[PDB]
C-alpha cells in the first residue's frame, strides 16, 4: 500500500476498508525501518486515527490506530506534537478503560511516548487525568507473564510521567504516584525494578523538597538493597537515586547511611564500569561533605584506603570526584580523621593530581592541603607534614604552581610556600 491508498481507504464509508487502511498504515509504521512518519502526518491521518480510537463497535480499528499513534509519537518532538495537536491525549486516556487488555496497554504505551517527549506533554498527560486510570490498571492482580509484560509497560509510562524538569512534575501528581512506586519496588521483575528505580532517581533529582518527598515514603532501605544487586540495570538507577538523596540535608544523608549504603560502596568504588565508579565517588564526596559522624561512618566502612586507590589509579573524571571527596573530608573532618587520611597515603596521589590542567581542581587540591596543614598545626606536626610533602615531590609541584597563569593558583601556592616551606633556622 501507498499513503494514497491508505488515505482513500480511511475516507471510505465502509468500515472494513477503513480498518484495512489503518492496518496498512500501522504496518508501514511498525515493520519498516525509517518509517514514513512525516508523509503520514502530512496526509492528515492523525485526526482519523484519533477518531478511530473511539470506535468501540470495532475494537480492531482502535488497536490499529493506537499502535499507529504510538509509533508516530515515538519519533521527533514535532511528530509527537502532531499526535498531541490532533487530540490524541484524551482519546488515549479514555481508551485506557478498554475492556480488551491489549488495546488499553497500547494506549498506555502511546501515552508513555507522549509524556517522555518532555515536560510540556508530560504535564498535559497529567492534566487530562491519566494517572488514575493508569493506577487502576496497576492495581489489578498481575500473576501471569502477560501481566508481567503489561506491568513493565505501565511502569515505563509512569516513570516517563516522573521525568524531566523545568518545570518539575506537579507535587500533587508526584504524591499521587509515589505509593505505587514504593509498591512496585517490591516486585521480582528486573525490568519493573529498573524502571521504578529510574522513576525514583528522576523524582530525587532536584531541590531538597523533592528528596524529602521520596525519603518520607520509606523506600531508602529497599533502594539500598537494590543497590547491592548483581544486575547493572538495577544497580545503576538505584545508585543515581542514592546519589541524588545524599546531595540533600544531613538528615536525608543520614537516612541513606542508616540504610547501609556505605557497605555496598567498596564494590562500587572499584567497579569495572568507569561510569559506576565515577558516580559512586561523587556520592562519596557528597557524603564526606556531611557531618563528622557521617565521615566517621565513611571511616568505619573501610572506604578511605579505597578512595586513596581511586585517587591514585582511576580515570581522570573519577580522580576529580575523588579530589572533591578528599577536600570535603578534610574540610569537615576531625583532626584524628584527617591524620588517618594522611596515614592511608593520600598525600602523593592528591599531589600528583596538581599536574592536571583543571584550574578549579588545582585550587581544590591546594585547599585540601591547607586543611591538612591546619590539622597538623593543631597537633604540632606541621614540620613532619612539610617533610612528608617534600619527600613525595609535593614541594616541587607547589613551587611550580607559583609560575601558573591563573593568579588564584599563584596566590594559593605562594601562601602555602610562605606559611610552611620558607623556614629559617639559626642554631648557635
Amino acid at each position: 500500500w501507498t499513503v494514497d491508498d491508505i488515505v482513500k481507504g480511511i475516507n471510505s464509508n465502509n468500515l472494513e476498508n477503513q480498518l484495512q487502511a489503518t492496518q496498512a498504515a500501522r504496518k508501514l509504521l511498525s515493520r519498516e525501518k525509517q518509517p514514513p512518519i512525516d508523509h503520514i502526518i502530512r496526509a492528515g491521518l492523525i485526526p482519523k486515527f484519533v477518531s478511530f480510537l473511539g470506535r468501540t463497535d470495532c475494537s480492531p480499528i482502535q488497536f490499529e490506530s493506537a499502535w499507529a499513534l504510538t509509533n508516530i509519537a515515538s519519533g521527533s518532538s514535532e511528530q509527537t506534537k502532531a499526535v498531541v495537536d490532533g487530540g490524541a491525549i484524551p482519546a488515549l486516556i479514555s481508551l485506557l478503560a478498554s475492556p480488551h487488555a491489549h488495546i488499553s496497554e497500547q494506549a498506555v504505551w502511546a501515552l508513555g511516548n507522549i509524556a517522555g517527549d518532555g515536560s510540556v506533554f508530560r504535564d498535559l498527560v497529567i492534566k487530562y487525568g491519566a494517572i488514575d486510570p493508569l493506577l487502576a490498571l496497576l492495581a489489578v492482580p498481575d500473576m501471569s507473564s502477560l501481566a508481567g509484560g503489561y506491568l513493565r509497560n505501565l511502569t515505563w509510562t509512569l516513570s516517563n510521567l516522573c521525568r524531566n524538569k523545568n518545570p518539575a512534575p506537579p507535587l500533587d501528581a508526584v504524591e499521587q504516584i509515589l505509593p505505587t512506586l514504593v509498591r512496585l519496588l517490591h516486585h521480582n521483575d528486573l525490568e519493573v525494578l529498573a524502571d521504578t528505580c529510574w522513576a525514583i532517581s528522576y523524582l530525587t533529582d532536584g531541590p531538597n523538597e523533592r528528596i524529602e518527598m521520596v525519603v518520607k515514603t520509606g523506600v531508602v532501605p529497599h533502594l539500598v538493597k537494590l543497590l547491592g544487586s548483581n544486575e547493572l540495570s538495577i544497580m545503576t538507577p538505584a545508585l543515581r537515586a542514592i546519589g541524588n538523596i545524599v546531595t540533600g540535608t544531613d538528615e536525608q544523608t543520614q537516612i541513606v547511611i542508616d540504610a547501609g549504603a556505605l557497605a555496598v560502596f567498596p564494590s562500587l568504588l572499584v567497579h569495572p564500569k568507569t561510569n559506576i565508579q565515577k558516580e559512586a565517588t561523587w556520592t562519596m564526596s557528597n557524603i564526606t561533605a556531611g557531618r563528622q559522624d557521617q565521615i566517621q561512618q565513611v571511616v568505619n566502612h573501610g572506604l578511605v584506603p579505597i578512595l586513596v586507590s581511586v585517587l591514585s589509579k582511576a580515570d581522570f573524571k573519577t580522580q576529580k570526584e575523588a579530589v572533591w571527596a578528599v577536600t570535603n573530608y578534610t574540610s569537615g573532618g576531625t583532626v584524628e580523621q584527617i591524620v588517618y587520611l594522611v596515614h592511608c597515603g593520600i598525600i602523593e596521589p592528591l599531589m600528583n593530581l596538581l599536574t592536571a590542567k583543571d584550574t578549579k581542581i588545582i585550587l581544590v587540591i591546594l585547599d585540601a592541603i591547607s586543611n591538612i596543614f591546619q590539622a597538623a598545626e593543631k597537633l604540632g606536626e606541621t614540620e613532619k607534614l612539610s617533610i612528608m610533602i617534600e619527600e613525595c615531590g609535593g614541594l616541587d609541584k607547589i613551587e611550580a604552581l607559583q609560575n601558573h597563569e591563573n593568579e588564584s593558583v599563584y596566590k594559593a601556592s605562594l601562601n602555602l610556600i610562605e606559611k610552611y616551606f620558607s623556614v629559617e633556622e639559626e642554631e648557635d
Binding site: 509509533n71 529510574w198 546531595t247 561533605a289 574540610s331
Partner: peptide, 22 residues
Amino acid sequence: RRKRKREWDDDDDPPKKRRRLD
C-alpha cells in the same frame, strides 16, 4: 564545604520513546 548537586548528562538514562515493531 558544600553538597554538589548532579550535573546534566545521560550516562544510561532510559529511553524516552519506544516504537512497537512486528
